Amino acid sequence: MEIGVPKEIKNQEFRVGLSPSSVRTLVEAGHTVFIETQAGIGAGFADQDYVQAGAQVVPSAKDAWSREMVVKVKEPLPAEYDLMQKDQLLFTYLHLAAARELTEQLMRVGLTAIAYETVELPNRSLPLLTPMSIIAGRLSVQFGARFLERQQGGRGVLLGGVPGVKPGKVVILGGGVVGTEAAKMAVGLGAQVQIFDINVERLSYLETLFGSRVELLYSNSAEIETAVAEADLLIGAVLVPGRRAPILVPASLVEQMRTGSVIVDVAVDQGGCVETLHPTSHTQPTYEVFGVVHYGVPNMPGAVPWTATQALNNSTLPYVVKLANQGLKALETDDALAKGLNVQAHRLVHPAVQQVFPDLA
Amino acid sequence: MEIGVPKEIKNQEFRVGLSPSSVRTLVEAGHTVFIETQAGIGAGFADQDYVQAGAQVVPSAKDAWSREMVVKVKEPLPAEYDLMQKDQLLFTYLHLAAARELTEQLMRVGLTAIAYETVELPNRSLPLLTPMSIIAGRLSVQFGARFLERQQGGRGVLLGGVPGVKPGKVVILGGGVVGTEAAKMAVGLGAQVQIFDINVERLSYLETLFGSRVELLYSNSAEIETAVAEADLLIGAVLVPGRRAPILVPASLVEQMRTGSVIVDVAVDQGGCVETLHPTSHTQPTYEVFGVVHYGVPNMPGAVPWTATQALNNSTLPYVVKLANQGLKALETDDALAKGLNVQAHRLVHPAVQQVFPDLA
Amino acid sequence: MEIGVPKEIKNQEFRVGLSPSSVRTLVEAGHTVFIETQAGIGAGFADQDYVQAGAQVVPSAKDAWSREMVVKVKEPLPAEYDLMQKDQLLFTYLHLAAARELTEQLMRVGLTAIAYETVELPNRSLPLLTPMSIIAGRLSVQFGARFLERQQGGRGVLLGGVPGVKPGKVVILGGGVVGTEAAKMAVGLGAQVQIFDINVERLSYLETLFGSRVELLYSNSAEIETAVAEADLLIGAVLVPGRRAPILVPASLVEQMRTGSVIVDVAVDQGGCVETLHPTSHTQPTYEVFGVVHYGVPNMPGAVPWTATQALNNSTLPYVVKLANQGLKALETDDALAKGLNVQAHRLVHPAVQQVFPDLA
Amino acid sequence: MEIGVPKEIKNQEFRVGLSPSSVRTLVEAGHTVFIETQAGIGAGFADQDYVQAGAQVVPSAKDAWSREMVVKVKEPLPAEYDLMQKDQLLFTYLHLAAARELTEQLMRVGLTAIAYETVELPNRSLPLLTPMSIIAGRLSVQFGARFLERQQGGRGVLLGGVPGVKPGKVVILGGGVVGTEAAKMAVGLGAQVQIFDINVERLSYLETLFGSRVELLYSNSAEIETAVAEADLLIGAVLVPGRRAPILVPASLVEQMRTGSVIVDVAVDQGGCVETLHPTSHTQPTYEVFGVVHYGVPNMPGAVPWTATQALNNSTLPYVVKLANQGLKALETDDALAKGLNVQAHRLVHPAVQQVFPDLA
Amino acid sequence: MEIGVPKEIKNQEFRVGLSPSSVRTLVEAGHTVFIETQAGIGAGFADQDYVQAGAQVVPSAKDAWSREMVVKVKEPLPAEYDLMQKDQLLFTYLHLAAARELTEQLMRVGLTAIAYETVELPNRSLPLLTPMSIIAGRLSVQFGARFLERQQGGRGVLLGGVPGVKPGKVVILGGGVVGTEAAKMAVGLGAQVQIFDINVERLSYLETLFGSRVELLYSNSAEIETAVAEADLLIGAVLVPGRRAPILVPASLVEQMRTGSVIVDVAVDQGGCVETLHPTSHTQPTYEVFGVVHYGVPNMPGAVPWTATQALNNSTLPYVVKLANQGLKALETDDALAKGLNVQAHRLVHPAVQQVFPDLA
């Protein structure tokens, strides 16, 4: 099949739909791939690398959008609305329940659009999101460390301390994937770490990973208050993929934290468990509330496009190939794919999205 | 004895001569301490904290310089030349072999000046520098990680990678204190690590710390070239405390590195083992040469003043107390202290400094 | 019930159907056991040991084959065809889809034959094969190390290296049971290790076992090529228990490997992922192709009969007892046993074997 | 030479001068050994075991004291004063600077007495004490855990906690041998551990043992107060082998501890760093002060005589053999032995003991 | 809803139905809580702590039993029979199949009684027992160590030994939750450890926890005999929650153990795998049989009420809240709760209990 990859045009998006290794793999299965010049460049992949792999490098986005399957990272933007075609297959992150216009737009055109974020397994795991959740957990600690530096605005604490001096204290709210990758990094820098969770079984599993090196605590208001008051770095890791999280950290609690302490909430764009935290821009990543530093820049994984592109591809790849081979039948061979289907022939097919635009259905 | 602590006035210096715990300790031994208001603030110590400890908080630097012993972090600056007095004891980092004027200035006045950096043990270890060298080793990796982020200018690599994706490669030149603290952090973030050193015995000792988790290699030109060419993060850790280091990394080698790779050299202010690296300012911390990012901001420990002040104090403290108790006799009870003596009664006493200003002697 | 154990007569087979501890256990449940003299000897079990346990030691194979249940390790050989009886229960490794004659032979006679290798659980795990797969994974590294010695034909590399010298690189294709036991050993000797697998979830689980000590990579052609080209020891561990494996390592790739490198493929007898590798004999275990050493001797576990016999017994034992107690009814109490049934009363009952000799059905 | 071993008669002393393995070794070198019946029994060594080894088992202490060399664990008691002889060599723990009468007594008689505790190396290490110091460090945590049980009087805390529940906090004052063996055990039970010491170099070495699993803190009044106030188990491990320790823990500090907390001070018999702690008896091992449980039973190693006897012997053995071979000349071949000499021919030879009984000299 | 918590009156029971953190949580959901004075005291919770949390502290048990829901730890005792009321909800450990009278008694009264021990998940896991099983596993080693001390009656062995001396040997029968928590502690003290189990898959999982640090052995009579004969500490951990365990350790085996060895069987009250072990009292915790020390005191977790109360609450809490919110409907929303139901309106509803008092049904 013909597959195109346009360059991402969203602001600060440097990742790319397919890496050179994926392309090569796709080419070995017959398919032919067209990639817009410079598409791979922000992720560290030159056109040359795409050529060695068997890709035809195209000079314009129009030449990349004109194919049967377009494989991207972000949702299409208005600027590209006119490049889309009637019978395409579109495979990327869509987040339709948040873009009425985009949703209508794909409906008018009539292609079939598959969202990475809704392809779901029998377990209800979202295999195409996890890779990004892992990266975000790991980055949270890297950003946190940076903002604890005095020049960056923090109190000036080294997480690991030095023999004879207290290490930094990291408090993590949420013991899932994100919270666990975060703990790995903090423990790696030598910090003292506490993780809270409401699931004891999860707490039990974590002990098999960390032994007694980390404090594993049940999330109850009383313990949270004490812990939080003593933290140098507070990490919100309750990323329950639908509705906002209950506030575990109220502004009153935040007033009780030390000056130059830092908060990072992985769930910022969706809604976090920290009352005072809201999204910020790249230009002004942080703000203070009570002398406590808030970092609210979203899409953490976008900071490491080289790593992030491959991680995503390792997971999307088997799906891309299934689609290129079977075209639309794969939706009737693959249940998870079937679940990724959001729009087709002018119809809104995704039950969850229908619920949001109940009148679009 | 009366001891004063003025606020550091050097640009971007946030550390303070004595922390509250030191003060308290000093007070319990009879001595009385005077600290200029806000002196502790950049390090996270409010005046109140100094009061609980037994310090008298003074409103002006003049009130802090007027004592028998002044305890500081950095060298005195011209602005303070007129606050110094004839029979003081001055204890701080001086680095006289680099400041002719300062040196003359202390000579005119006639106090006795003891440099933290020359107090040396029979082993020739410099007990008052080590604490900062440890912190600098640990920070090198924290800075390096930050500059590998795409928005910061790097290729966009997560050091630890994710299962299924390659981790970052960190190459460390020098297996001493700095290089070893750096490896600890890199290994902690999940990176693949290589350390080079010319001392096999040192390599042998490192294996007792890391087992087979890190590659321990003999420093020879041939291996260095290969390693370096493949690095995402190159760390210069040859901090031989006198003369500049031989260039282990020539510009030609640097041209061979990947674009978006990062170099950090802990020995920048003194002279590093990387040809192309020179000091930079806080305002413009990095620059590119061959698409390779260079970070040249000196005094790494200044980023974590809270941690750095205590670490320094844990080491200087026993000396400060000896001086406050015995005054000038301690130099004749303590050999290491004796070695810290640089200037006294208008005379340049330090052999190494005499060698530099041979006509000042 | 009466249970016999004949001595294994296949060439180079030193294991035995039941160890002394199993016998004792069987005896405590009423059953009586007959074992041919010297049957246990290649595995390190003298007849005396069988006597203390309650076994009756028999002087001939005929005296051991004449019982209601015969428990063995390998398939019966022509030489023994005439010792078999009409209503026996035979429990051993059969591999019928590869022995037309054996299959016919058991059909003529009319006993019921249960194959260790087809007794399968609801998960489709083959509980009676796993023990051997674990041993084979562990041995692969032990053999590999031996063939890397110069006198054995390899380049002369110590896997662990020594401080200051590069360790050996081990590349493992397949992240399942075999590949994972192999990594354990290689990491144990100090080698640098990479594991490739197509299942990310499997890669994720492996990180919980190894942390960041091993490189966990997605199997794609591009990465495989690079890795393989740099390997000292290449281990094929794709042992998909039915059909041959896709060639992951083509002869062209092998021509690119260093001279004195070694390849071991655990799937040799069934068909491996390395093009150039074919079975060899004990007498001439290895051969060279492109200066690259190939080890092709099958049945790795046969090298450690003492360990291998107990491991097998720990797993077969509960089945042997069920059969001795309930006779043929156990097949209607035990689904897994039911699945092990291959031949009974002149009928070929195993669906998979029928598929191979569709005219035998 | 003839060597005797009497049974220890001190109350609650179950150890014995030589184990069976030592005896055997001594016998193989020519020497002949006489041991009083039941001498080994409290340590788990029956007379039979002594016989197999080559010892002659004697029915009375008189038969054991009558030899050229007597090897014991404790000091001789009045009851045995009359069994001693004029030219014996006595080798045991003496602690003369605390027993005027014993000292005079050995002077009257005229034997040469060598104290285990003063045999000292060029480093001033006391090789024959260390073994007991290691055991005491390990036991401190075992006793501490027991007294934290509610029925034993403590608050009812499990040191390791369980996932979801806080672990116990153990605070250790002193980072030497004792303090380090104690930390090993506490970390082993899953506790949260802090160690304080005044030597940073020692703190640095400890990090090579524990990594970031334990908090390594500089001993200053301020930090001690906070730590101590939060402890479940406080362990005093400043066992400076001459004079009493400075009080690190004043009664005022103890009033600030939680009820049901426990204190153990390894230096009780000599004088500890905890104000309120004094020796207690086996019959009433503990007492409360402020609701805080105090354990003051001395000679911790006496609780594990089997382990303690061998540990001691492994160290004394080479000395016992040197003495049996060279008799009194060994003191002029061995400097450390020379230093162990306390009394000889009616003369008090030990400089330290002379200082205490300056008129005995 | 109104919730009461009476003080536990059973002998040596110091735990309490709800901790202060639970109370607070319950109060934040509307409910109001009444706790008898001193109820929390044996667990380390003063009334004051209950007040801060929102509890009303009541002066009598009658004031605590008079509520709609009573939350306790142990079964009601005759002394309280008259405090119970007709429409209460009772939630505690009941163990009815062992108390005919209690059972009848709850039947007369007519409340609904829910047993912690029968609330069961689809897996048949008993979520409200596990917390206690974990604690008991950990304590087994702490008690064992204590009884190996000479004064306590054991041979005088330190589990960890010291370099140069043999460590203690711990043999654990049963590889489940209890046996695994026990191994964690023993390994933590430095002991040599063997675990036996009949499930190889379980043995396989344990290797992922311990690597090669522990010996993982299949439970067969022959190996058990040898192991046991060499043990210093034998731990019975076959706690199959219904019927007694098969005797793995017969008196004959016990006669073969060393004198001063210790046995602890976690399953004592229910019936253990050690023939000679029977329950003992607090007053006389142990007894000897063949010179081998037996510890038979039941309810190990009662020794650490502070830890044990929170652990239990972390698990019961979500159930208590569901009951307080939905009252009796929760039994028809929650299957696990439904399974906890034992008695209601004069009827014996629990199938297992009916089987025991078949005439009560």
Q: Which token pair is B143?
A: 């800075």
Contact C194, C214 (CB under 8 A): yes
Distance in angstroms (rounded) separating the CA atoms of residues C257 and C250: 11
B202 assigned ligand-binding residue: yes
Report the residue count for chain D: 361
CA distances from A7 to A11, A50, A60, B256 (A): 12, 13, 9, 28
What single-letter amino acid sits at D34?
A: F
- Return all residues near C260 (Cβ < 8 A) that are at least 6 apart: C148, C150, C153, C154, C155, C156, C157, C291, C292, C293
Beta strand spans in chain C (E) = 2-5, 32-36, 56-58, 69-71, 89-92, 112-115, 169-173, 192-197, 215-218, 233-236, 262-265, 286-289, 292-295, 341-344, 347-348
The phi-psi region of residue C297 (left if phi > 0; otherwise alpha if psi is between -120 and 50; otherwise beta) is beta
Nearest C-alpha neighbor of A165 from the set E150, B180, C258, B304: B304
Helix (H, G, I), strand (E, B) or coil at D240: coil
- Return all residues near E255 (Cβ < 8 A) that are at least 6 apart: E290
* C87 is a catalytic site residue: no
Q: Which residues pair with E72 in a beta bridge?
A: none
Element (H, E) at C355: helix C351-356
Query: Catalytic one among A47, A49, A95, A334?
Result: A95
Torsion angle of the four alpha carbons A121, A124, A127, A132, in this order, in degrees rounded to the nearest 10: 170
Rg (CA), chain E: 22
**Architecture of domain A1-128+305-361 in this structure:** 3-Layer(aba) Sandwich (3.40)
Q: Which residue in A200, A208, A221 is closest to E25 by CB distance?
A: A221
Helix (H, G, I), strand (E, B) or coil at C73: coil
Distance in angstroms (rounded) separating the CA atoms of residues C126 and C339: 10
For residue B68, with 0-12 CB atoms within 10 Å meaning exposed, 13-18 middle and 19 or more buried, which class applies? middle
Other residues' Cβ atoms within 10 Å of the Cβ of residue B315: 21
Q: Report the residue of chain A nearest E209, measured CA to CA.
A: A208
Q: Which residue in A14, A150, A304 is closest to B304 by CB distance?
A: A150
For chains D and B, having 3+ Cβ pairs within 8 Å is answered yes
Q: What is the resolution of this structure in A?
A: 2.1
- What is the rounded end-to-end Cα distance, in angstroms, of chain A? 31
- Return all residues near E73 (Cβ < 8 A) that are at least 6 apart: E8, E13, E15, E16, E17, E92, E93, E309, E312
Query: Catalytic one among D47, D269, D278, D334?
Result: D269
Q: Which residue in A200, A208, A220 is closest to E25 by CB distance?
A: A220
Q: Which token pair is B184?
A: 């600890």
Query: Catalytic one among C47, C49, C232, C269?
Result: C269
Q: Which residues of E are annotated as a binding site?
A: 15, 74, 95, 133, 177-178, 197, 202, 219, 238-239, 266-269, 297-300
Q: Where in the sequence numbering do the catalytic residues of B fall?
A: 95, 269
- What are the backbone angles phi and psi of residue B119, rounded to the nearest 5°? -65, 115
CB contact under 8 A, D203 and A164: yes
Distance in angstroms (rounded) separating the CA atoms of residues A224 and C325: 59
DSSP state of A7: P
Q: Which residues of D116-128 are buried (b: 16+ CB within 10 A; e: fewer)?
A: bbbbbeeeeebbb
CA distances from C191 to B127, B196, C183, C185, E109 (A): 38, 18, 9, 9, 71
Distance in angstroms (rounded) separating the CA atoms of residues D179 and C351: 68
Please report, for chain C, how many H helices and E strands are present, in that order.
12, 15
Contact C282, C297 (CB under 8 A): yes
- Tokens 């006799």: give the residue: B329
Q: Which residue in D200, D208, D222 is closest to B21 by CB distance?
A: D222
Q: Which residues of D304-330 are buried (b: 16+ CB within 10 A; e: fewer)?
A: bbbbbbbbbbbbbbebbbbbbeeeeeb
Chain centroid offset of residue C209 CA: 24
The contact set of C with E (CB < 8 A) is 20-22, 24-25, 28, 53, 208-209, 310, 314-315
3-state secondary structure A63-119: HHHCCCEEECCCCCCHHHHHHCCCCCEEEECCCHHHCHHHHHHHHHHCCEEEEHHHC
Query: Catalytic one among D95, D265, D294, D346?
Result: D95
Our CA-based measurement puts residue B185 at a distance from the nearest CA of chain A, in whole angstroms, of 6
* E346 is a catalytic site residue: no
The method recorded for this entry reads X-ray
Q: Report the residue of chain A nearest D164, measured CA to CA.
A: A217
CB contact under 8 A, D303 and E151: yes
Q: Which residue in A163, A204, A212 is closest to D190 by CB distance?
A: A212
Distance in angstroms (rounded) separating the CA atoms of residues A31 and A40: 19
Four-residue CA torsion sign, E76, E79, E83, E86: positive
- What are the backbone angles phi and psi of residue C284, rounded to the nearest 5°? -140, 75
Beta strand spans in chain A (E) = 2-5, 32-36, 56-58, 69-71, 89-92, 112-115, 169-173, 192-197, 215-218, 233-236, 262-265, 286-289, 292-295, 341-344, 347-348
DSSP C207-225: HHHHTTSSEEEE--HHHHH
- Return all residues near A51 (Cβ < 8 A) that are at least 6 apart: A57
Q: Report the residue of chain C nearest A206, measured CA to CA.
A: C208
Element (H, E) at B215: strand B215-218
B177 assigned ligand-binding residue: yes
Q: Which residues of A are annotated as a binding site for substrate?
A: 15, 74
What single-letter amino acid sits at E252?
A: S
Q: Which token pair is A308?
A: 């992030």
The HSE-up count of residue E111 (CA atoms within 13 Å, CB side) is: 27
Contacts C21 to E, Cβ<8 Å: 220-223
Pairing of strands A169-173, A233-236: parallel
Nearest C-alpha neighbor of E238 from the set E223, E250, E248: E248
Nearest C-alpha neighbor of A168 from the set A117, A87, A74, A235: A235
Torsion angle of the four alpha carbons E269, E275, E281, E283, in this order, in degrees rounded to the nearest 10: -150
- Return all residues near C128 (Cβ < 8 A) that are at least 6 apart: C116, C117, C119, C312, C315, C316, C319
Output the CA angle C12-C67-C64, nearest 5 degrees.
35
Distance in angstroms (rounded) separating the CA atoms of residues A184 and A166: 19
Element (H, E) at E58: strand E56-58
Say yes or no: do domains A1-128+305-361 and A129-304 share a fold: yes
Nearest C-alpha neighbor of A12 from the set B149, B151, B155: B151
Helix (H, G, I), strand (E, B) or coil at C301: helix
CB contact under 8 A, D221 and B24: yes
Distance in angstroms (rounded) separating the CA atoms of residues D77 and D211: 47
- What are the backbone angles phi and psi of residue E35, rounded to the nearest 5°? -125, 130
Q: Report the residue of chain A nearest C206, measured CA to CA.
A: A209
CB contact under 8 A, A314 and B157: no
Distance in angstroms (rounded) separating the CA atoms of residues D154 and E44: 10
DSSP state of E78: G
Helix (H, G, I), strand (E, B) or coil at C173: strand
Distance in angstroms (rounded) separating the CA atoms of residues A219 and A198: 5
Helix (H, G, I), strand (E, B) or coil at A4: strand
Other residues' Cβ atoms within 10 Å of the Cβ of residue D46: 13
Rg (CA), chain A: 22
Nearest C-alpha neighbor of A117 from the set A67, A79, A74, A80: A74
Please report, for chain E, how many H helices and E strands are present, in that order.
12, 15
Distance in angstroms (rounded) separating the CA atoms of residues B286 and B294: 5
Nearest C-alpha neighbor of B312 from the set B177, B172, B152, B130: B130
Longest dimension (CA), chain D: 67
- Tokens 């051997």: give the residue: C132
Q: Which residues of A are annotated as a binding site for NAD(+)?
A: 133, 177-178, 197, 202, 219, 238-239, 266-269, 297-300
Chain centroid offset of residue A68 CA: 27
- Return all residues near D98 (Cβ < 8 A) that are at least 6 apart: none
Q: Does domain B129-304 have CATH number 3.40.50.170?
A: no
Pairing of strands C2-5, E2-5: unpaired
Which of A204, A206, A209, A220 to mutate to test binding with chain E, by most E CBs within 10 Å of its CB?
A220
Pairing of strands C69-71, D347-348: unpaired
| Alpha helices by DSSP H, chain B | 20-27, 47-53, 61-65, 100-109, 130-147, 177-189, 200-210, 221-230, 251-254, 305-326, 335-340, 351-356
Four-residue CA torsion sign, A152, A156, A158, A162: positive
3-state secondary structure D180-233: HHHHHHHHHHCCEEEEEECCHHHHHHHHHHHCCCCEEEECCHHHHHHHHHHCCE
Contact E191, E169 (CB under 8 A): yes
Contacts A190 to B, Cβ<8 Å: 184, 188
For residue C82, with 0-12 CB atoms within 10 Å meaning exposed, 13-18 middle and 19 or more buried, which class applies? exposed
Return the domain boundaries, chain E: 1-128+305-361, 129-304
| Alpha helices by DSSP H, chain D | 20-27, 47-53, 61-65, 100-109, 130-147, 177-189, 200-210, 221-230, 251-254, 305-326, 335-340, 351-356
- What are the backbone angles phi and psi of residue B99, rounded to the nearest 5°? -130, 85
Element (H, E) at D36: strand D32-36
Report the residue count for chain E: 361
Q: Which token pair is C91?
A: 């429990």
Contacts E304 to D, Cβ<8 Å: 148-150, 156-158
Contacts B260 to A, Cβ<8 Å: 44
What single-letter amino acid sits at A287?
A: Y
Which of A19, A51, A314 to mutate to test binding with chain C, by most C CBs within 10 Å of its CB?
A314
CB contact under 8 A, D216 and A187: no
CB contact under 8 A, D217 and A190: no
CB contact under 8 A, A220 and E20: no
- Tokens 């602590």: give the residue: B5
Contact A253, A260 (CB under 8 A): no
Distance in angstroms (rounded) separating the CA atoms of residues B175 and C303: 43
Contact E228, E258 (CB under 8 A): no
- What is the rounded end-to-end Cα distance, in angstroms, of chain B? 31
Contacts E126 to A, Cβ<8 Å: none
- What is the rounded end-to-end Cα distance, in angstroms, of chain C? 31
Contact E15, E309 (CB under 8 A): yes
- Return all residues near D328 (Cβ < 8 A) that are at least 6 apart: D89, D112
Query: Catalytic one among A47, A269, A278, A334?
Result: A269
The contact set of B with D (CB < 8 A) is 20-22, 24-25, 28, 53, 208-209, 310, 314-315
Contact B173, B236 (CB under 8 A): yes
Q: Which token pair is A132?
A: 């990004």
Element (H, E) at B294: strand B292-295
Nearest C-alpha neighbor of D8 from the set D55, D62, D75, D95: D75
Element (H, E) at E323: helix E305-326
CA distances from E50 to C97, D209, E21, E58, E185 (A): 73, 43, 9, 11, 34
The contact set of E with C (CB < 8 A) is 200, 208, 218, 220-223
For chain B, percent helix, then strand, then coil, each to nearest 5?
A: 40, 20, 40
Q: Report the residue of chain E nearest A217, measured CA to CA.
A: E314
What single-letter amino acid sits at C264?
A: V
Q: Which residue in C25, C208, C209 is closest to E220 by CB distance?
A: C25
Q: Report the residue of chain C nearest B209, measured CA to CA.
A: C163
